[PDB]
Every structure is written in C-alpha cells, then in structure tokens.
C-alpha cells in the first residue's frame, strides 16, 4: 500500500481495522490527494469494484482450487496434531519400503527424521 503524502509501504493484513472510516480520516485522505495532485476513484469503477467483491464473496470454489488452498496452508502449516500423525505414518510406510528394499542408507535418515519429529508428551 502507499499513503499519498508518504511513500510506499508493505504491510500485513492484520494491521487493518474492522472499524469504518471516519469523516476526518477521509477528509485528510482527500487533502493528501489534492496535495499530491491525484483524483478520487470514479463511481463506475466503484461499482465495478463492488461487483467484483460480491462475485468473489459469492463464488463457489472448485475442487482444484480448494486443493491448491489446502496445499498452500499446509506449506504455511507450522504444526498440527492430525497432520503430524499422518506424516509419521507416511514416514513409517517409507521406512518399511526402504527396509524391504535392503537400503541401509535411506532407513537411517528416516529413523533420524522420525526421532526428531517424535518424543511426544
């Protein structure tokens, strides 16, 4: 984002407040736009944004989109008990595959990884 008077800034989402914009805030924004020499968004563009928000909020996600969002949050997932159990089970399956294939090098790494992940309370 960017203030008109100030410069560009990268901000996270939680900084924004759910409270509505007050009259002096919008007036100060208009004064900053006039100082920089900019204009306000057109009413046609305002309606286009409103329709875009309503369509996006009322949209129905597809299976592929839902799976992509789930994979994205799984990448963001630091830890979750169900997911840790599933990962440990998958690692155990990979470990038995490596043991049955007589691969003495992979199994040590999988055991070390399981030891690091494990030791619950």
């Amino acid at each position: 984002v960017a203030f008109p008077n100030q410069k560009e800034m990268v901000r996270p989402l939680f900084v924004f407040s759910d409270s509505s914009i007050t009259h002096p805030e919008f007036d100060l924004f208009l004064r900053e736009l006039d100082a920089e020499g900019l204009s306000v968004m057109d009413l046609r563009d305002v309606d286009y944004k409103y329709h875009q928000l309503k369509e996006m909020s009322s949209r129905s996600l597809s299976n592929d989109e839902v799976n992509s969002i789930v994979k994205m949050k799984q990448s963001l997932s630091s830890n979750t008990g169900f997911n840790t159990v599933l990962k440990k089970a998958q690692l155990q399956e990979e470990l038995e595959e490596a043991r049955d294939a007589h691969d003495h090098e992979r199994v040590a790494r999988i055991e070390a990884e399981l030891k690091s992940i494990g030791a619950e309370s």
Partner: peptide
C-alpha cells in the same frame, strides 16, 4: 466520472475478518 461519496466507499468495506 462522478466523485465517490462516503457511502460508495462504505459499500466496499472489506474487514480483517473478511480478509482472513
């Protein structure tokens, strides 16, 4: 081409909960 009023901006309020 008309300027946007306060109510027009209020129609497109997108809260932090809505962002999440």
């Amino acid at each position: 081409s008309k300027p946007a009023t306060l109510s027009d901006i209020n129609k497109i309020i997108f809260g932090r909960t809505a962002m999440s």
